[PDB]
């Protein structure tokens, strides 16, 4: 429909202009970078470099490309200045087979990066074994051969070095043991799964290991279930918990890094549901505020009650669970429920991914399909 497209372009233009006008009363920080190629994935690397005698530091982000088969794809590392504000630079490009659907660094060895790539292969790169800019086609340290179709689920086990979980559109979850010692710069190793789960009946959208329990894996799917897997058990059995969490597709799961029982799901039904693992079959609460499918989900690494979500409504929302149930005035209620702390409306296309900065409080990096990287911080008046 042409009229729909005309209206969408007009409303995005008007909303952006209204957003820019109110930025000074919303943010302590907004940095905008136009990327040469759009990225489906983003993750802060864990290192921070103070520049002494200066009011900034240097931090780094993992990006990828998705040319869609035209040109060479790349895993990239961007260096960004942050106030203790201005520049970005791609400090490393590593050739990559196909779209970078997701990229994640190994928590115990940040120079190792796993990706989800061409036709379902996952890839391992040791970025210290690659130059800053390389001529040819991809030469990964390892290809993980297992999925038969492209995928977006990818998570390292933070309590078992080299243990990786993937999930893809073939409805399969793979578990892997990546041993970096066998790597060389010469040739690509072939790794195959140590276990496969066939526990979903539709695309597997997200997997995540429990941060404090090495054998607990959570997964969510287009089949509308949230499942909790015990990784020590018979892979052919049913998962210990199958939860009918939403009535529409579930795109993301996120386990709270402070409260071991608290878990969030994000769904095409426009909501985020909260779950307690000790009564997993009815939800604790529904976070309502998005106007379209919710895709991205990440707990704050610094504050137990703070959750961020992103949506095809082009907003990133920050939720403060301590404000649940709090009395509102009618004029305040016009903005939505009280637990909706902050809305970031600076993007102008669909949000691909976002990531909380681990070295700065209240800093998010978020990407949209129109090549825009934004690094922002809501005003301390709002969150203090």
């Amino acid at each position: 429909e042409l009229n729909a497209e005309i209206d969408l372009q007009k409303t995005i233009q008007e909303e952006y202009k209204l957003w820019k006008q109110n930025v000074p009363f919303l943010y302590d920080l907004v940095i905008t970078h136009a990327l040469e190629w759009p990225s489906l994935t983003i993750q802060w690397l864990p290192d921070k470099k103070t520049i002494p005698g200066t009011d900034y530091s240097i931090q780094r982000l993992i990006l990828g490309t998705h040319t869609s088969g035209n040109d060479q794809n790349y895993l990239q590392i961007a260096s960004v200045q942050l106030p203790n504000s201005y520049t970005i630079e791609i400090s490393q490009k590593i050739p990559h087979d196909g779209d970078v659907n997701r990229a994640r660094y190994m928590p115990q060895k940040p120079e190792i990066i796993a990706t989800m790539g061409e036709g379902g292969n996952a890839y391992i790169f040791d970025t210290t074994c690659h130059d800053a800019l390389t001529t040819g086609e991809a030469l990964p340290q390892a290809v993980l051969k297992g999925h038969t179709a492209e995928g977006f689920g990818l998570c390292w086990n933070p309590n078992l070095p080299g243990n990786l979980a993937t999930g893809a559109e073939d409805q399969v979850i793979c578990l892997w043991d990546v041993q970096t010692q066998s790597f060389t710069s010469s040739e690509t190793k072939v790794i195959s799964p140590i276990a496969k789960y066939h526990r979903h009946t539709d695309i597997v959208n997200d997997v995540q290991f429990h941060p404090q329990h090495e054998a607990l894996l959570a997964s969510v799917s287009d089949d509308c279930t949230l499942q909790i897997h015990d990784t020590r058990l018979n892979p052919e059995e049913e998962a210990p918990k199958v939860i009918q969490a939403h009535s529409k597709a579930i795109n993301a799961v996120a386990i709270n890094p402070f409260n071991d029982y608290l878990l969030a799901t994000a769904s095409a039904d426009k909501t985020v549901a909260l779950w307690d693992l000790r009564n997993p079959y009815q939800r604790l609460h529904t976070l309502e505020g998005h106007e379209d499918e919710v895709y991205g989900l990440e707990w704050s690494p610094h504050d137990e009650p703070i959750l961020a979500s992103s949506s095809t409504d082009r907003r990133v929302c920050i939720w403060d669970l301590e404000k649940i149930g709090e009395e509102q005035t009618p004029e305040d209620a016009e903005d939505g429920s009280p637990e909706l702390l902050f809305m970031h409306g600076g993007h102008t296309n669909r949000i691909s991914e976002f990531s909380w900065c681990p070295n700065e409080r209240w800093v998010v990096g978020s990407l949209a399909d129109d090549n825009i990287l934004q690094i922002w911080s809501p005003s301390r008046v709002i969150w203090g």
Partner: peptide, 14 residues
């Protein structure tokens, strides 16, 4: 369709 929360601006402006 809110692009920001007005109560946020009210909090920051004053």
């Amino acid at each position: 369709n809110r692009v920001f929360l007005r109560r946020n601006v009210r909090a920051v402006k004053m």
